[PDB]
Amino acid sequence: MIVPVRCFSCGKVVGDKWESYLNLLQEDELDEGTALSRLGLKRYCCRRMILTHVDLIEKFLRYNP
Amino acid sequence: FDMGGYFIINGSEKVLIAQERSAGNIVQVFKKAAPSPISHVAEIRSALE
Amino acid sequence: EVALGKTVRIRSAGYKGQLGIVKDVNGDKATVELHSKNKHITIDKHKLTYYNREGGEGITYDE
Amino acid sequence: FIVEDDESLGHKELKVRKGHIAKLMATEYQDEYTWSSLLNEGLVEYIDAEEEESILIAMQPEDLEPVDPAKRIRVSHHATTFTHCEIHPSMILGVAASIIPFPDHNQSPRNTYQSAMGKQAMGVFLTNYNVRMDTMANILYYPQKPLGTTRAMEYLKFRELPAGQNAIVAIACYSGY
Amino acid sequence: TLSHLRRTNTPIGRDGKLAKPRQLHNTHWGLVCPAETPEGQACGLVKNL
Amino acid sequence: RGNLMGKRVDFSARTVISGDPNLELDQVGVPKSIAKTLTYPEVVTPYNIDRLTQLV
Amino acid sequence: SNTLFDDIFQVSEVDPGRYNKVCRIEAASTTQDQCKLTLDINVELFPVAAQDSLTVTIASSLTRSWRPPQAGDRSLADDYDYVMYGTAYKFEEVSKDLIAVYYSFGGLLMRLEGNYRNLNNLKQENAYLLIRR
Amino acid sequence: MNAPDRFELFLLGEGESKLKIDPDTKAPNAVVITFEKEDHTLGNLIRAELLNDRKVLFAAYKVEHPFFARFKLRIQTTEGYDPKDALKNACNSIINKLGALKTNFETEWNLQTL
Amino acid sequence: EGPQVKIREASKDNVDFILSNVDLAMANSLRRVMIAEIPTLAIDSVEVETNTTVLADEFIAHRLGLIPLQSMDIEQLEYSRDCFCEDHCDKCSVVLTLQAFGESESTTNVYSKDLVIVSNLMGRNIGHPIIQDKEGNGVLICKLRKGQELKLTCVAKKGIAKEHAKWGPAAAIEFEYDPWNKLKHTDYWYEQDSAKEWPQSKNCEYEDPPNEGDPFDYKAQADTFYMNVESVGSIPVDQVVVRGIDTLQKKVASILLALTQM
Amino acid sequence: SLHKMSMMAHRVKVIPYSTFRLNLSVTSPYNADFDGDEMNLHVPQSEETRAELSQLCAVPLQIVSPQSNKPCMGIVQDTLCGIRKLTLRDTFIELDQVLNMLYWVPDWDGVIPTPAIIKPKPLWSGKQILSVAIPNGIHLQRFDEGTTLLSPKDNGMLIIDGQIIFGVVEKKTVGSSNGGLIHVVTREKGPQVCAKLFGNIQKVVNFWLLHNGFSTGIGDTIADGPTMREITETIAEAKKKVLDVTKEAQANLLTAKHGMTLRESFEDNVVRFLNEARDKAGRLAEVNLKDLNNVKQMVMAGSKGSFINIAQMSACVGQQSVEGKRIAFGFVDRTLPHFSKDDYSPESKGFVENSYLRGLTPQEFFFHAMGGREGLIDTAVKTAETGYIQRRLVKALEDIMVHYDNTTRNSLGNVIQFIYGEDGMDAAHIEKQSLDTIGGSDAAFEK
Amino acid sequence: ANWPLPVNIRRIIQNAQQTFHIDHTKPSDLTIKDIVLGVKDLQENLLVLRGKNEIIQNAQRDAVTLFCCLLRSRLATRRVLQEYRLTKQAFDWVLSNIEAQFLRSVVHPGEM
Amino acid sequence: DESAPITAEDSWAVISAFFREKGLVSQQLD
Amino acid sequence: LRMKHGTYDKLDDDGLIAPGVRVSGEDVIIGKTTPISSKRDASTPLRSTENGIVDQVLVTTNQDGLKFVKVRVRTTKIPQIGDKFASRHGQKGTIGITYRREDMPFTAEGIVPDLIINPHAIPSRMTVAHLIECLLSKVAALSGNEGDASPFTDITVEGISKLLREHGYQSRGFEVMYNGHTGKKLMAQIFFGPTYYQRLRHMVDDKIHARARGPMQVLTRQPVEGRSRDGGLRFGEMERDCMIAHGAASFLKERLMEASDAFRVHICGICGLMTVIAKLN
Amino acid sequence: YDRKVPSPTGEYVKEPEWVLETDGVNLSEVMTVPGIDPTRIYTNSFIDIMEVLGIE
RNA sequence: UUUCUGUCUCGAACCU
Ligand SMILES: [Mg+2]
Ligand SMILES: [Zn+2]
Ligand SMILES: [Zn+2]
Ligand SMILES: [Zn+2]
């Protein structure tokens, strides 16, 4: 639904950086690896925790109610 | 993302499954075992399609 | 028992500060379904602060 | 794909070309060409089980018409009379089986058990679970597209509605539990 | 949901019978998924395209 | 075959199994809930009166 | 509670024996041409190469809960590079003059072949084998 | 529905002491301590210290089952050494080494401007 | 002295160091307390007065508890269980509130900044939601429409990570020792050559490499423990390691006190 | 409940969680796998009922199987692999870990075993630390492929007075074997002592494996370049041989084998040659691979996996059988649309050329699937058949029982056998033993 | 040669050697007469059936024919003196143990 | 250029065209 | 009325449960009273084995105009030991244990696994695709780019390993690991990396049940079917055989008479029929 | 087929002999054929073995 | 000072 608050494995906070990741992907047109590394995720656990998210909250949100 | 292709019957979504059958209007030759007196049947499920 | 079927808050246990609903009382020990966890727990009814139908003031066991 | 010379070079080549694929991608990005137009121009033809009897099919769209030791090998093309070719062999797999990473590397019974179990996996079944009052629904808290994704996953729309999570697996014998 | 929409049944009884229909003939290529199937009494009879 | 050779019975449970190397060979772990429901009728003697009164 | 066998051995052949931390040495005495030894050594702790002279002895001292030495100055047969502990398990005869004794030093095998000068060897768990380079 | 509760993972239970020493009729001068509501975090550390002491013959810690938050240490010492004193000195050495490490870390940080 | 420290890099949320002349058991137990026993403040009890977003109350509650909170003066905040007060007291918990009513036609994001502390801290810098991101929003919580209210009252209580991973103040505690096989503590899997196939650790250049000539060292032990503690942000890495030592010390002291009491 | 030991009385341990926990070594007689399996607990309601369940049918008493006079239950899982890596010759253990594993054995006498190596440092052999779990008075002596007492490969096994003299522990020692450690312990010391032995051996080996580690992965399946080259060479040689056999058949210079026609003769020759090629490729893969291979350790432990497993793992999946024969020509004289008709080559007729590490071409994958669901359907029908046969056998033999004249008689009383099993000896108590009068020459018997 | 049979005589003998600490150098105090009589008495005491009469002794002798062949194969005089070195008291212990384990090994009737 | 031979990578555009018109429930819908 | 023993305060005057309230066990969800010709209860209770918070309630008219009500109840369901999980390669298992990050093993870089799978899954099942998925998934997280994991792509394991090595790791996916209890480096290395896993429906909360003298069948007075109906277990023919083999005749008698259904039957000696008009009073 | 036979020295030795296996069930008439060893003839059908040789 | 509800029957899908 929403980006997870913390990395499941290490517990690093990754909910801070979802919109920064989207901005680096769209505005700056950086590849996935560069965007993640510049956001400061070194461990592949955190890196997949941001890379594999699906922004299902948008789909659920923009119904009527 | 709902593809459709189902029926809402009493509020419950129901789907009909494709049912296999031998094709109609084709001659099919089958051997038969020794205990059966019949040997070499030819079948055709003729029908107005 | 007046305490039956009332919103309660536990006070000396690991589940303290937690809402609950009193389900049955076997005498000196009230069973409450936790209004947080999907588990029933027995705890002495004297050490629970009971709340009215809506939240607000917390009344001890004096009713 | 239909295979026919169409030209003077003599070698048998498919009917679809880079121009056709470019126009297909162009209409993709715009939304003109479509599967229907592909059929009408006769670049793709439908074959059923009975018509499969009398056609020789090419596996790879380019390889069989005309080495690193770990690289993929193939039975040589001693036939110069191919008539069709697969679009891609992966499409023999069904919906549940095409979720699988590397089914060819798997054993086939495990592919079958996966094809049964993926139907029972947990995920987002639809984006309208708030309004549907289904008898029994399961919604994963944080769905996740797998790191290893099959190219058919975009048509199955699995990445949009995935069912499962990525976990750091350790193939380890740690506690005996 | 997608598999159910694209599922195929076979009228043959689920009870103990010959294994020939339960097998896949070579002609299932590209028409029936060689892997996807239920396990147990329906295996090889229920087919997914 | 369905009610005499094999039939139904109370005082029983069914659930999943997990491995456990820290359990003795002839021992088996029972969920607390399953223990709470299942019972054994034990008769009152002088030799267990104190424990049975405590259990009650 | 004293030395039962003592001799020099010239390690004739060292075989890594497929293991990384253990090797089998086949050795023959420099004195008694008919005495032979074939013994497993933890080469990691006691490196050994072919054609080395090794002073082997077997002792029966220096129930019984083992303990660390408790003291830098505890007396013990400390004049040896490598001491192992094992139990004899077999004594076979060959050529009606030579006797071969088998020891297991916690799964490290030795065969010690020689004539009846090995008579002191006894089927007792208490058997230390000490080696000096 | 009946998973074990997790505040008792380190909180003392009602009518349950932190330590239970009882002797051991199993080797001479050997005692058994059951540490309730502890994990490997101290079993490994207190046991490593007890093995660093020269006058202690046996020291080994134990977690029977991960469900129950309790470990259990056995110490066998030499004659005239109360294993309670052995455990006391192991703990005292632990606290001293930790005080040294804490002071060292604060000093090294305050040295380093960042 | 005894244990020795050498801090290699330091940062707001990271510190790498070397521990020398210390037992492997001691280094590990220090880490274990550093990952489990350090107390921290995190949101514990969420009360929803009006929720109308597209998310479960259980969902948003779990999300909110995972939010880091400033917990510098956590030692000064007394444990909830030890408190005997009535009508939860500010000496046992920190009360926050989140009121996020979307107005804009676009989706209105809800961030860590929106929580406002309502309880009386009394000069203790405890309970501020940590805002580590570059722009300064905070951690994304949930998103709203123009019509969707979200009104809730949070109670954050002291707790350790052994209750729940939310209270963990350290994310990743890198740990390594003997980068070479000087102690032979691992047999390296290989096909042709272990030296070729295995990457060299970054710490390999902070030890002398081994020599093929000299034999294996019998009596060597695990020393020179290269660590790197990262903080989620609730507690600076200063205090992450320092409070970690404090809890391990205090717990061994409590064992001693139990011994003397009995 | 396919067999007798699938219903055993256990001692309750109340344990807070939602799942039955059971000792791992009792999974074999139950045929349990913890893969979502469920099991069934029946609580007795009387003192008769409890006494019957404790004295008649309890796991320690049920260790020995009457079915094959061997232990039904043994140490068959990662504990087997751990005990093998433990009792490897070169596995030496610190004072630290020795102290902990020793104390894991609760049977343990109390004396620290002395090290096998003391002065360079106190070091205990894996076998030595294991031996504290085996009770005193256990004598075992198994000789493998001409093991000698100086066993260079550490094969075989020799245990004296509960001390493992040598021999790496495998399935054939601590698993379900007639001459096994479990068998001799149960027959000598008894059921309670043997159950304690299961507990102690598991506890020691699992502690050791916890602090040691074990894994598996890609590198455990890849073989080196020369091995892959020579594997391709053997497969190509087999293919050339099959092509030559085919050409001889096409020119019908091949005489059909006795009792077989020419078609079936050609097919038998082809399937034999493809099987031989797959076996040769597997042999080369194994002899290349080393004990640092996790998989080779797994097979040599014998906990699970096999040679055919490794061969298909890394070398060649092999010729795929459907209905006990090669892939039948489905469309018209062709196995799939991609081969022209009359194609009898191995690739066309189901021979997978390459392994699962390396991948399947799509024809190979489809033939793989056909063989796979052939196998699955075969088990799905065999379980039904075997269930019916078992039920019939039970209804036939239900009333027979050895009555107190040592006669097995049914409900009417008809003597089925005047002596139970021609001896009157309970099936569990038999063991395999030699008779020295039969063998040997007259001279040997004389001497 | 290897065939299933009721009690492991080799394990009984090895257990006797270990629990008696049998010394191979020392001469044995057994006598040939004692060995033969002890073996015969064991054979007669190995009961699975019991009547005082022909057909049941034939049934018993029949039932224990193979096991007694094993016993005379193993506990021969030349074997018991050459390859084993059991004393008199160790021999008696072995015979008693063989008898006890056989009586254990008898079917426990009422077995299904 | 437009008439050049085609790549197995670029067949996936054709597959996308298939699932763009027909989708995955084409059989039941038609 | 014939109301149930479950609580009823959860209802409000309207007849629903005042959404926001939560329920459990045998709390009533819809409050219905059927007239009888004063009235009786027909309210549907909540499932005994399931509980949670009421997410939503619907009230409407059906085709015929009779009021129709649809109440939806939400619960969080967290992994437990008995919960079953599976990869996309047939590797399925129930959780054995739940260990914390401290007791978990750990890599050099501090990455702690979310799951540990026993290597006994691999050889028997021949499941190389799980391992290749793990290697590709590690390369995918290390590069950031998604790994085309399709069935018959050109990519091979050597290429995967070469990329993984270029990213400063093993070629083969192994990686040195350290014990969580002591920090001892593991003597053998651990294959490691991200892999996709699914939570399957079969979970112990839904599959656990025990009985002791519950509702009986109306016909046979044997226990009724199923967990949902407070049902009971069965002693099949095969298990009867196993007990017959065991010799626990007392067990079988107790289990098939006293624990299942015991009926006292008076019979006449001359006829031996169930025709005795017994007036025990 | 190699059979174990006592050698004149008295040790069992492998002796290869010739054996005619068949795909037919006719015991009564085949057992008469001169030049065979009817004492040893065997047939896969226990039914014909009974009907020719007897119940035992 | 007022308590032992309660079901069948045809299937379908899935688990071991
Ligand atoms: Mg299973
Ligand atoms: Zn992470
Ligand atoms: Zn307070
Ligand atoms: Zn009558």
Coordinates of C-alpha atoms in Angstrom, one line a residue, chain D residues 72 88-112 114-115 148-153, chain E residues 33-36, chain J residues 317 320 355-362 364-366 368-369, chain M residues 88-90 125-130 132-133 136 148-153:
Chain D
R72 CA 22.4 -22.4 -25.0
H88 CA 8.2 -17.1 -28.0
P89 CA 8.4 -20.6 -26.5
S90 CA 7.6 -19.2 -23.0
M91 CA 4.0 -18.7 -24.1
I92 CA 3.3 -22.4 -23.9
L93 CA 3.1 -21.8 -20.1
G94 CA -0.2 -20.7 -18.6
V95 CA -1.0 -17.8 -16.3
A96 CA 0.1 -19.5 -13.0
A97 CA 3.1 -21.2 -14.5
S98 CA 4.5 -18.1 -16.2
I99 CA 4.9 -16.4 -12.8
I100 CA 7.8 -18.8 -12.1
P101 CA 11.4 -17.7 -12.4
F102 CA 13.2 -20.2 -14.7
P103 CA 10.7 -23.0 -15.0
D104 CA 13.1 -24.8 -17.2
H105 CA 15.7 -24.8 -14.4
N106 CA 13.0 -26.1 -12.0
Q107 CA 11.8 -29.7 -11.9
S108 CA 8.4 -30.1 -13.6
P109 CA 6.6 -31.4 -10.5
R110 CA 7.8 -28.3 -8.6
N111 CA 6.5 -26.2 -11.4
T112 CA 3.1 -27.9 -11.0
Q114 CA 3.9 -23.8 -7.7
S115 CA 1.2 -23.4 -10.2
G148 CA 13.2 -11.8 -10.5
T149 CA 10.3 -11.2 -12.9
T150 CA 9.3 -13.0 -16.0
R151 CA 8.6 -10.9 -19.1
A152 CA 5.0 -12.2 -19.1
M153 CA 4.5 -10.7 -15.7
Chain E
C33 CA -0.1 -25.3 -19.9
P34 CA 2.2 -28.2 -19.3
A35 CA 2.7 -27.4 -15.6
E36 CA -0.5 -25.8 -14.3
Chain J
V317 CA 18.8 -34.8 -16.9
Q320 CA 12.7 -39.2 -20.3
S355 CA 21.1 -30.3 -16.8
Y356 CA 18.9 -28.2 -14.6
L357 CA 21.8 -25.9 -13.7
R358 CA 22.3 -25.3 -17.4
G359 CA 18.7 -25.2 -18.6
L360 CA 16.3 -26.9 -20.9
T361 CA 15.4 -26.0 -24.5
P362 CA 11.6 -25.7 -24.8
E364 CA 13.2 -30.6 -23.6
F365 CA 11.1 -28.7 -21.1
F366 CA 7.9 -30.0 -22.5
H368 CA 10.4 -32.9 -19.0
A369 CA 6.8 -31.9 -18.1
Chain M
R88 CA 7.9 -19.7 -6.6
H89 CA 9.7 -23.1 -7.0
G90 CA 7.7 -25.6 -5.0
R125 CA 13.6 -31.4 -5.3
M126 CA 16.3 -30.6 -7.9
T127 CA 15.1 -27.0 -7.6
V128 CA 17.9 -25.0 -9.2
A129 CA 15.5 -22.3 -10.1
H130 CA 15.2 -21.2 -6.5
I132 CA 19.2 -19.0 -9.6
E133 CA 16.4 -16.7 -8.5
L136 CA 19.6 -13.0 -9.9
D148 CA 14.8 -10.6 -16.5
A149 CA 14.0 -14.0 -15.0
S150 CA 12.0 -15.3 -17.9
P151 CA 12.0 -19.0 -18.9
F152 CA 14.2 -19.1 -22.0
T153 CA 16.2 -15.9 -22.0

